[PDB]
Design a protein around this ligand. Sequence first.
Ligand SMILES: [Cl-]
Ligand SMILES: [Cl-]
Ligand SMILES: [Cl-]
Length: 288
Amino acid sequence: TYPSRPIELIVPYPAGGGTDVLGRAFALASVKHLPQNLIVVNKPGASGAIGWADVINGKPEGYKVALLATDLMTQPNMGLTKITHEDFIPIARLNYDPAAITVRADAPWNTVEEFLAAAKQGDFRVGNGGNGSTWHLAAAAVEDKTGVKFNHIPFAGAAPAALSLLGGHIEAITVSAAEVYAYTSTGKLKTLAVMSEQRIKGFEKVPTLKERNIDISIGTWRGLAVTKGTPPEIVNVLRAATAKIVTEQSLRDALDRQNMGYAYAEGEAFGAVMARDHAFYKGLINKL
Ligand SMILES: [Cl-]
Ligand SMILES: [Cl-]
Ligand SMILES: [Cl-]
């Protein structure tokens, strides 16, 4: 009966970081719900592709689980790997941290519509965490749907971009809502829209872009998958266990400590989101 020996959780991040913490918290929370241990392996490199290859090239027996992340959407579409979401069977999404449009609290704009009408008259500087990464692509996605043209300002990560905005050196940032909450909750920045499917915790008074008729959902995420070809009975054991594991308070606490949003999605739903996002990133990366 599956599982009959330990299961490796292949985490393509170094030990000690947020995703390692998430992976090990998931493993700890799995003790009541799987009769074999989940063992974390840290295999970073090539934006996840060394870890993906370990799972894909492994046997379809259920004893390797990939901790999938956003890079799976961008790397193949940048022509940097042949690996795609279709090499996997999804178990579940765990985490999603949507991008947001955030300005300084004293900005003249009080709605995303006012911000866009102003931006269309100029070359607003929009900070991100690096060229070609999620928050840059988030700003580019806004350009694509609204016709505005920004001056993209990459920094060495999201935190320096937020500090720049706080100092009045740029007009907006499109980094994660999670990264600006410390400032929006304390009146230093204000968020005009979240690029999510639904309103999120801590930002319940802020509209999504989608509800304002701007069709964009983008952000970083973490989920679980096994290699294509894994028997359905095995996939179902993992999906059923994961549905239990995500209700564990210890796992939710770990996500909170790492400032990572909880966003459980069932396997098939996670698969559908990845297919949609793959096509979205393909189109946007090609345009850029
Ligand atoms: Cl991380
Ligand atoms: Cl977020
Ligand atoms: Cl499921």
